[model samples]
Target: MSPFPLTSMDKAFITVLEMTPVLGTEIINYRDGMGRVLAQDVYAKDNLPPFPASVKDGYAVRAADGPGDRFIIGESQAGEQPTQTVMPGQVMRVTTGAPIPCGADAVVQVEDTELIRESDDGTEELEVRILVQARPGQDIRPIGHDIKRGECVLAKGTHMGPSEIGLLATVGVTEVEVNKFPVVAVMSTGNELLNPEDDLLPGKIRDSNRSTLLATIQEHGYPTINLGIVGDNPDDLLNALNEGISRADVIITSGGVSMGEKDYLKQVLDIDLHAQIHFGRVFMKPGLPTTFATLDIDGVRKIIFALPGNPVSAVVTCNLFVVPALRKMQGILDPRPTIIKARLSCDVKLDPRPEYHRCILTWHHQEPLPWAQSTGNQSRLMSMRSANGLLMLPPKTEQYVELHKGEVVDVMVIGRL
Candidate 1:
């Protein structure tokens, strides 16, 4: 066993989750592919528009002959073909999106024309002049302007969104190959663990960790197997772990990975499972007992992550590790959680041990200001007040650092994280 004094969170994460194989791929119909990671690049087969379309309702003409004035020789509207070609000093009356006639080089808007002379044939000739100068190809939506034929539209490992769905529809891709979300089994062990719905008994608190954990995992957009709860008995705990491992690609448990006397998961996992256990304690408060391991189940490899039963610690650890790993398994190219730096609203102190202090955030304009007030009574059960983000405090900082009002620091949102 490696001695554990302080392990940086990033280094610990790299050690625990190194070299994951590519996720299994399968084809899914477009209807069921939303948020699924793409397994192949899709390219457009045809031009988006496939024709030159007009941008305005106007007369089509060869600009050289229609500079000053011209006679309206024919009228054309959208969806109709002009049989007669526009000749010099003659213009065709065209409406919005009407195809430009063979001899017309530019469109002179209808509003720019004035009634000219009455012809003997009773056809009113209007004098039209080009109001705005346009170069060749101006105002023309050439075929494939938006998306060129045979060009890549969506790359592999892209998470399907509305825009991607639309692009696939345009490219005639009704079905797609994508990676599936990994299935995870969740469980908690401890004699003190209590179900939230059960009547409160002496010395047993409600099982806030299980519900919070399941909800948090669900929010990461993965399927979950709730393995229920287990007491600290060795046989019962091992039985639950074995059953859960058989069905899930990953297993997550709480309350038994710590170094205290009550911690049985560490021993059971190492001895019976022969799993590779990485560092247990992270350089963060409220989550020092966070642990990670890899084991074989039913001849298939799986990961096991253990977090301290403290509500705040378990939830935060899930955000930092579980969610990102799941995303990576789903073939996400960029799975890092979005983080924002904020200013501290007041002076605060940190424990000698490195800590991830939970706090609420306020914003000035677009800038964030993490609340400087230490969450009063920082117990693990007080997650309701602090699980959203942490005011990253370095080890052994001054009790109060003066900023008058605001200072910059790191703030994280659990939803986005």
Candidate 2:
């Protein structure tokens, strides 16, 4: 291992996560807990199904009574119970999801039997011929089959999705303790930047980074504060930074971290606020100038992510770094972006810095693995259009050469493919 501690992508990810402070928990209704992370383990309060139930619309009969015609003594619908038990020579007509009768041990599906007799009304009484052998507990859902009483249904740090919400409801959890979402403050720094409402000036471009970043954060279910655009002046940048620190848990700014003389964000963070700069540089494409910092405001620690000025860079860094921090703050155990191995559809040249090349992943019938095709022009904002995965390309070195067609590589999935 090299003695010098230069930050790799993995190292930067781990460092940022280590510095993230998990937010406090809040009690919320399980129905409203979608997209929230659980702060505590949730246990099942009652056995799922709560009773022995029939899983098939059929007759509930004793297992010992072999295939034979039996008298239907009573009926068991979904919400009603049988008035009489199923004796050896009798069975109960039970519908799916209905509780089994007191003496029945198994269920024989209606398709596997024949109706030998029926009342004049056709719905009142019946005698069925059992054609299939149903062993003990066959087609019967036993008590606690889905979930046992007091069993841990969901663990802490689990990210709650639709299925998790359904599980919570099944376990009788009306309310859950979930981690609070972090408030992210987004801002863009540049004297030549104008808001979308403003007409195009001689030397100014519309400030699209702030709006895009804000929406991206909101899309991931976190609340965002739009600090808008700050000028290149030190006083203006300082005021914006202070306001964000006081209001939000994480502050995200695009531009003002590069080598340009007008760049004032780095100065405001390091000189004005005396914030601890964690890593000002990372070895990655498009976002090589990205910076991460932390500051102590009163007694609370606030994270700052200074992203590059380019729109693509801002979005990539936000997805790679800021999103994970937000997820960690909300108590998600595995907050990193999902990564999978995919084969390259075409050859790609290597860069000195490790490249997060944007691409669209597709499955072809001729290939066993998913194929990734690059979305041309990494710096162009349009490159992200229709791109769902980032092809992880290693830096060019003596041992590792440029990637070739059919070569397998790791891909970070950022959106639905």
Candidate 3:
């Protein structure tokens, strides 16, 4: 009765995931705060508008004075105030954004006025059509309409974006405090591993896991340290793992997590490192060889996750688990990415292992296409052909379900969650 799939590989992957520790928080400047988690709640320092400003350029007068011969008493601009007080028979000429002068309860647009007469004293009198009535507070922006002083503007653990940035700026917050970015240490292990930049010899393959894991950690907003590549030898694996545990919040290693004769990661964790095992394998294909462990080193809790050397499997495991773990560590209260329904363009059969297959996700008139046809061969080692996302096929099902040209299926937007 294994908590994971019957396969030991699947059990390994589950173990590391459940054992990883949660991350802590820190304060940061709001200017560099995009994608960072808010460490504290934010409140407005003062009312947004601070005063009643005019929304349009017009004359400020009593609503009852509409459509009448009102003499011009004073003019009010944005920066200048009226020295003459508004009386019952007088009106003040106002412009947009100017504060509503005292004794004025309404505004009449200049377009609604007519030139009544030119007095011999060099003054021009105007008359407004009394056809419409003015309601109190019309065309006036009240103070605190946008936001009130001491109001909670943002909550803790909020992921800051453009809209959040603007809101913080509006509330006069030039700087902010955010959680510290999680630190990750990544490594690759195999006797046949060669640096991609180096020329590969007869039985050696280029190390794709190093670069892939590094990029993934970077995208997750963590400070990542790449420990380079190691061989299947126990000493090398032990040294690399020890160094990784000392420097990072989480240690991720690709390859050497399986039950193969050369797989030394499990032995190192159980013997030299003494890590607590959670689960080993998951009920998924490609990533069936994944493994995980939790260890407390030198008063700091850390996690170690291992993925298969095959590029496809490594990527699949990272997406399904690593992404979520990182989001949680960063204090992202809701880290679930938006999933949309789309129509599968073609038919797909399920593998007993419930494989999550990759495909080029395309939207045809706002629907997803089936085209699970591999970008090339379906071998996990040749996963360069896989798409950013997997097209999921339901388990124990066969035959083409009638997915119309515009029917809806589930689509996960990569890297946007």
Cα lDDT of model 1 by residue, 1-417, tens digit: 533456787787676557343468988887777779999999888886665656677777676763566777877767877788888888777777777777777776657655565567867556666565556665556677788889999998789888889889988888888997788899988887678788978888778877888898887678899888898867887898888778888889988766666557777778877887777678777688788888754556678888888877897788777877887778888776666776665565557665675666544465444444346544454434544565666566465533333666666566533
Clashing pairs in 2: none
For residues 145-241, write the lDDT of model 3, one tens digit per residue.
8899999999987888889988888998877777766788989988889998989799988999889888877876678998999888788888998
Scored by TM-score, the top model is: 2
TM-score (all chains, Cα) for each model: 0.80, 0.90, 0.82
Model 2 regions more than 4 Å off:
1-10, 132-134, 377-385, 398-401
Candidate that would win on lDDT? 2
Worst 10 residues of 1 by lDDT: 378-387
lDDT tens string, model 2, 159-245? Answer: 889999999878778888998889999989888899999999899899999988998898888889999998878898899999999
- Per-candidate Cα lDDT values, in order, are 0.73, 0.86, 0.70
Worst 10 residues of 2 by lDDT: 1-10
| Native-to-model Cα distance after best TM-score fit, residue 36 in candidate 2, in Å | 2.3
Judged by lDDT relative to the true structure, which candidate is superior, 1 or 3? 1
| TM-score for candidate 2, residues paired by index | 0.90
